[PDB]
Design a protein around this ligand. Sequence first.
Ligand SMILES: COCCS(=O)(=O)Nc1cc(-c2cc3c(c(OC[C@H]4CN(C5COC5)CCO4)c2)COC3)cnc1OC
Length: 863
Amino acid sequence: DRVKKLINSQISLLIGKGLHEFDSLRDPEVNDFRTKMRQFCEEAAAHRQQLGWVEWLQYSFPLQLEPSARGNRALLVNVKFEGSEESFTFQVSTKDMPLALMACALRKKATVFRQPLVEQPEEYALQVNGRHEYLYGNYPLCHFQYICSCLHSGLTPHLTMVHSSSILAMRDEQSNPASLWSLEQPFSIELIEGRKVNADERMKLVVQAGLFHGNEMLCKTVSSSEVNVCSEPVWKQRLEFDISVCDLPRMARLCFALYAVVDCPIAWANLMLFDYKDQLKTGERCLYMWPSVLLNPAGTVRGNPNTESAAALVIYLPEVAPHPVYFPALEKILELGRHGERGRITEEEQLQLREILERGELYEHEKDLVWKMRHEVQEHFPEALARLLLVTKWNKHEDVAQMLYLLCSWPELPVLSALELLDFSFPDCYVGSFAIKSLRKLTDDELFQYLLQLVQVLKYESYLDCELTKFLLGRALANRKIGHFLFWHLRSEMHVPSVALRFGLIMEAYCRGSTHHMKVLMKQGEALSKLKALNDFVKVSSQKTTKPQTKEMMHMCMRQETYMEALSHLQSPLDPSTLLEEVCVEQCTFMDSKMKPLWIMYSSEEAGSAGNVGIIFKNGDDLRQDMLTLQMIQLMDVLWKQEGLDLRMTPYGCLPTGDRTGLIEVVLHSDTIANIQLNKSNMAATAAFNKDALLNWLKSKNPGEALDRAIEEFTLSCAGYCVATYVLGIGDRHSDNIMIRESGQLFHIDFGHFLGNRERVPFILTYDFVHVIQQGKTNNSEKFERFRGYCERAYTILRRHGLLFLHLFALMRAAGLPELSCSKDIQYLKDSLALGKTEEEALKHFRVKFNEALRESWKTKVN
Ligand SMILES: COCCS(=O)(=O)Nc1cc(-c2cc3c(c(OC[C@H]4CN(C5COC5)CCO4)c2)COC3)cnc1OC
């Protein structure tokens, strides 16, 4: 009642769109989605409210494990009990399970409190101090990201013994409140007129139209007559396509493009021929067009919401029957496709078929063999499904039904095959559903790794109520970390009108399933809102006065009650495990770059040294490419680690949150190469030669025996970053966008240009880094060639996963990133990974590239 109303207003402020606007559309598809998804999400909320206490830890604090541990040494740990002022430090082994550490902690408590305890270690979980992170399960301590991280930095793990009753009180606190195949006539539409058309009066107006099944044409494109340029052009002409109404596939889309001719692009618009209830569309349609930047089949199938300014093409869909006509039900489809001729071929053609199914464009005769032998593709080459789907004639209902019959008894495919099938090249809904079925086996860790791409896929969907939305919602409601990033990936695109309805509707549905998480995300939004206002202040102030003056005023503004309250005690949007507790106003500042990004520091007494975390708030730039590049660098690190190779990478968080707005994770104890190379006097790193500065800095940060492992960290990370930047074509690399951690770890920042952006980016070897790798010596081939080996190993591991990078980048094309919009961009990846060559041919080629980069480094070594 009063709560229903509050939650509704809270969801509205959270998603950045009033719920009343969904009702105002009076759209039955929108109303059905809201009803269906609200129900689906409320069932997940009820399922969760009754979860066991370990299951509720699996939901809220999913395990953060080392990639090499998915599916021996002395260790010092500090353990306290919940709300106890006293802790206990004790030696454990890296091979010990959390349970042994717990039994240890419980025996200590029994002896200090002089009483034999009722408690068993099974009734407890271990929280990482001041973090929404927990250690539980039968995994050795070294398998946990937190422990493993503490071991490299030499830090002592700090853990809190949390009872099951405490966890069950968290679960209770966070509770939700109380017949077409008959119609043989050619496809046709009436092109009535246009409205609000703005163009050069010297020219004429033409409407190009085409029927598509994804990006493939179903027939040849057709064009209207040339009508004189005016605000309201009138055609009233029938456009006739070469394709029977019975041949129209379920996912057929009618695409329009309006242009001015003497070409000159003005606008475009698409629509689905069948609705969400499978009915073949009849009557008049007003298409509110999107301004063009020749047809756009990949474009959205919903009209431009800016009705007041947008051009509108009025069309008529004919009543080809006196009663409604729905697309045949699956039972009628299987009944038609059931009957086929099983292909029988020679042993010679059997080797030729094997050759092409294991080989990727084909010749016509090669496509006919695949289609002839489709039954054998199902039985002996099921991973060749995508190649089979590409030869299927989508403009012939008899061929489509035969394809669908084989697909409905097709064995589930590996995750890598299923990711390829979500591409827009496979637009059929049954293929789409099959691809989601083979993706249900994804682990939460795999799903997390590919979520950004699966959210981009939502922009290729033709209808709101889809298998991918239910799958993303179900997985979001089952894992709080998936939930968090699903929300932010959707929320960050609400300023984009083509997606605002889809995205707003999914977030509302999500909020229905988690009232508590909605309130938690609102706290995140309240902090971001304040940051925007604070950053606006800084942008204006930085142009009018000195930096000490702007920094002081920034501080006074932060010191206001409203600011101190909104900016404190929130989960980080960059990582929900990270708690941003007390903002340290004195340690906050801003950068000197164009957008004057804010540098916000936090502290947490409960987390200790681990609670000292920073975020960078940046407003003015599109942060989506930075996020993608960094996610690709993190994926590389995961693949390398799975082959036992740790190149000591720094894939720091980067998250868009709003319109040209986002956060970047601060890596503390790091400085740019440019700052270190300044070679300021009265510093511990002051050098005799500028080439010594970076090694002297490493020396002051790592005294005595520590220097040796810092040079190794630098070498390892340098090899990984040399490989990452080359493979991804990261260019415009200089001293101010390369950083170094005190540990020796090198890392890259500011990924605004990738995939060659257009020039093939050569491999880069910088003399200042070769100097450190060589331990400051002129000649140190032992050290240098050990670095080349790290580079080669890293490169050949990525190649073996080349299809994964290709599949994920192809899915990203949906995002609309200016540097990832066609085949030219994916070609850079195919080239840089040398995927068309053998491992020997590719490795030899990488060596030609690495050697060319060494001779280039020698042009600076000569001086
Ligand atoms: C278009 O200009 C690109 C640069 S930007 O700043 O505008 N934006 C940006 C910043 C960062 C990034 C990330 C990290 C760090 C970092 O350091 C920059 C300073 C910070 N300095 C301390 C002294 O007070 C602040 C020390 C010297 O380096 C920067 C450190 O850990 C992670 C990444 N990407 C960016 O954009 C996409």
